Amino acid sequence: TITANKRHYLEKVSHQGIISALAFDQRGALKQMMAAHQEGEATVTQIETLKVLVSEELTPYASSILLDPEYGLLATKVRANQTGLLLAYEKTGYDATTTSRLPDCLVEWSVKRLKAAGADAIKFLLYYDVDGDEQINLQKQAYIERIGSECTAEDIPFFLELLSYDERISDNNSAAYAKLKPHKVNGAMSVFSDKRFGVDVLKVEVPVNMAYVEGFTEGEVHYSQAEAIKAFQDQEAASHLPYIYLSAGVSAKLFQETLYFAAAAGAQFSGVLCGRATWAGSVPVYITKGEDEARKWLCTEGFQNIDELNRVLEETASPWTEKILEHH
Amino acid sequence: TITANKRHYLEKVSHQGIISALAFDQRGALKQMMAAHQEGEATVTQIETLKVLVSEELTPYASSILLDPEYGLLATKVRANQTGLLLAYEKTGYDATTTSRLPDCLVEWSVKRLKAAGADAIKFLLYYDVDGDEQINLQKQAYIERIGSECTAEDIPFFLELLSYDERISDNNSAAYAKLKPHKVNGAMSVFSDKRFGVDVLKVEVPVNMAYVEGFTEGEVHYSQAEAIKAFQDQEAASHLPYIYLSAGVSAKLFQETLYFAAAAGAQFSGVLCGRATWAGSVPVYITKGEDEARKWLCTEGFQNIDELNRVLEETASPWTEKILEHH
Numbered sequence: 001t002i003t004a005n006k007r008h009y010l011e012k013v014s015h016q017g018i019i020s021a022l023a024f025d026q027r028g029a030l031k032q033m034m035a036a037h038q039e040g041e042a043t044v045t046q047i048e049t050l051k052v053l054v055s056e057e058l059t060p061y062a063s064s065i066l067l068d069p070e071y072g073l074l075a076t077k078v079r080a081n082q083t084g085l086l087l088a089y090e091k092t093g094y095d096a097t098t099t100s101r102l103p104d105c106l107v108e109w110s111v112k113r114l115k116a117a118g119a120d121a122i123k124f125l126l127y128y129d130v131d132g133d134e135q136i137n138l139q140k141q142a143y144i145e146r147i148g149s150e151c152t153a154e155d156i157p158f159f160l161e162l163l164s165y166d167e168r169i170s171d172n173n174s175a176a177y178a179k180l181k182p183h184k185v186n187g188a189m190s191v192f193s194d195k196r197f198g199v200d201v202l203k204v205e206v207p208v209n210m211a212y213v214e215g216f217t218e219g220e221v222h223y224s225q226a227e228a229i230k231a232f233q234d235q236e237a238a239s240h241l242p243y244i245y246l247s248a249g250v251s252a253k254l255f256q257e258t259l260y261f262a263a264a265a266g267a268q269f270s271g272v273l274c275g276r277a278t279w280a281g282s283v284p285v286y287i288t289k290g291e292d293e294a295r296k297w298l299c300t301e302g303f304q305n306i307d308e309l310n311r312v313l314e315e316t317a318s319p320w321t322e323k324i325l326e327h328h
Numbered sequence: 329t330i331t332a333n334k335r336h337y338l339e340k341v342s343h344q345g346i347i348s349a350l351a352f353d354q355r356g357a358l359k360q361m362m363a364a365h366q367e368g369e370a371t372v373t374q375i376e377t378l379k380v381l382v383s384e385e386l387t388p389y390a391s392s393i394l395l396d397p398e399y400g401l402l403a404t405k406v407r408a409n410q411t412g413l414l415l416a417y418e419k420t421g422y423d424a425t426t427t428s429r430l431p432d433c434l435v436e437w438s439v440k441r442l443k444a445a446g447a448d449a450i451k452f453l454l455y456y457d458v459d460g461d462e463q464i465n466l467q468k469q470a471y472i473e474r475i476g477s478e479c480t481a482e483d484i485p486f487f488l489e490l491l492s493y494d495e496r497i498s499d500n501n502s503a504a505y506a507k508l509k510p511h512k513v514n515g516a517m518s519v520f521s522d523k524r525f526g527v528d529v530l531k532v533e534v535p536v537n538m539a540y541v542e543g544f545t546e547g548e549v550h551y552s553q554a555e556a557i558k559a560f561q562d563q564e565a566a567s568h569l570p571y572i573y574l575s576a577g578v579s580a581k582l583f584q585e586t587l588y589f590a591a592a593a594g595a596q597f598s599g600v601l602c603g604r605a606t607w608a609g610s611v612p613v614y615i616t617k618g619e620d621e622a623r624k625w626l627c628t629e630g631f632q633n634i635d636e637l638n639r640v641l642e643e644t645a646s647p648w649t650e651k652i653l654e655h656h
Contacts, residue, residue, distance in 0.1 A: 107467045107471075110477065112473045112477060113470060138436055139436060142435065142437055142441060143438075145441070146433070146474065146478055149478040149482060150474055150478060150481070152481035153477040153478070153481035153526075
């Protein structure tokens with residue numbers, strides 16, 4: 001169930017029950033994107049600045065923005081009036097040499113400090129393999145419980161981001177992984193739907209890899225349209241909690257088509273936390289052509305991406321007001 | 329402010345506003361004491377068994393018992409009727425090669441699970457140098473906030489144990505540390521008295537090293553009685569929260585003499601969490617002579633230790649009902 005104070009915060013990150021939220025808590029991934037356009041490492045100024053620009057120019061078209069508290073704090077100060085704030089709570093990345101991918105909170109933060117920094121919602125990313133080591137998964141469940149309790153005490157929405165994986169498979173983009181994806185994504189959602197975790201909204205992947213779905217590829221087809229529909233219906237049945245889709249690395253167009261497919265399949269998602277699809281193109285422009293030109297790109301191409309996305313959301317998304325349970 | 333549920337739980341670990349608590353969450357320290365009487369590493373069995381025995385025979389004489397959830401789970405089940413339970417939440421010990429001594433929760437636990445395991449109160453041990461690295465202390469402050477928030481959400485008493493230290497001094501027993509103890513202990517208490525930490529009871533050291541106070545030793549003297557009195561008065565001024573004394577490594581006799589001295593000085597402690605002084609002598613008996621002999625020792629020498637302590641407690645301690653602020 002949802003509390004009155006949590007609901008009131010949830011309304012801040014939404015518009016009319018729909019979360020049309022801009023994702024820009026990327027840290028490692030952004031450093032990589034920037035590195036492919038210049039000689040040196042990305043500086044603190046560069047990361048802080050592009051986040052400021054994206055915040056300034058695109059939050060007028062988003063119901064909320066997700067930012068990291070490491071680099072994105074300047075960007076929290078420059079939001080358009082109606083734009084809610086989500087702050088990431090996890091340390092970025094994982095040790096790829098080991099299999100466990102254990103969760104770890106930013107050492108300088110607590111939910112109380114995140115709330116004090118303006119957060120309307122707490123976000124935490126957990127890598128989860130539902131078929132993985134049981135003691136590792138006990139470890140992960142205890143960790144989420146702690147964070148859920150923090151969010152219960154501070155009476156603020158907890159958004160749990162679930163990234164599925166397999167202990168034995170390095171590459172999430174492989175065909176071998178694609179066959180397993182529905183099981184990993186839906187099984188994880190199902191585990192973290194238990195009241196014990198205090199989750200208010202799930203932020204999840206689409207249950208299939210669209211690159212291997214009939215009608216979306218020139219190559220190997222691992223699911224028919226009907227099979228992909230079934231995987232979305234399974235996602236819909238996997239939880240009772242509201243959920244929003246993360247875009248991962250896909251283009252504005254593929255994501256948009258994914259949302260149409262999702263809605264046609266009967267998936268009832270309350271929004272998206274869309275990142276790279278919207279702002280990826282500003283990275284080359286900012287790094288090579290400077291600050292002023294990046295601003296122009298955001299107000300034209302960047303706006304086009306986000307505005308198209310909002311149009312699709314308006315047609316496809318199901319308000320969380322349909323799903324949320326009141327605490328009276 | 330104390331909540332009605334938190335107070336009800338706190339009553340379970342107390343008798344008439346006084347916490348006469350038996351402390352047996354020792355892990356590393358117990359392994360050390362056992363290794364002094366046999367050849368090898370102490371077995372899991374041995375640690376679990378002695379905890380069961382001390383619990384079985386001495387909890388009839390304590391308002392509560394403190395246990396660790398790593399080895400003490402068997403011992404939780406053998407408590408006398410009136411005896412409440414506190415469970416430790418921290419990983420035992422610390423890396424002695426670095427100065428930071430950063431807090432870290434047992435990876436398999438959350439406050440929720442500690443409650444599920446029967447805890448009436450949650451104890452967490454933090455090493456704190458009030459004069460230490462500011463960013464390290466920020467880390468520690470954030471960390472306690474998380475734990476405090478957990479305990480607020482689960483509506484369960486949070487006992488914060490503060491062990492003071494100096495970043496430059498490894499040995500707490502030394503004369504060099506003795507001169508610094510009052511400032512370290514009282515300063516730490518003062519910091520963690522802020523509402524933001526959600527602490528209900530402070531578990532703290534006596535502010536001086538009694539073994540170096542005039543009148544308590546033949547040998548080196550580092551405080552006059554007038555100076556020891558001042559340290560106890562500063563301790564009483566350091567917080568508004570109820571606090572209880574840990575006995576650390578000191579003998580039953582010196583602990584009792586400390587309590588009388590503390591009360592004379594004006595210290596208003598609400599009880600003790602007393603460990604080694606009470607049961608230490610059962611350790612050689614159990615390892616060398618076995619189960620039955622340890623039991624006879626607990627029912628005789630062990631009872632004597634605790635019964636004398638309780639008598640002194642009755643004369644010296646001030647009930648926490650004199651200090652706690654109700655929520656309405």
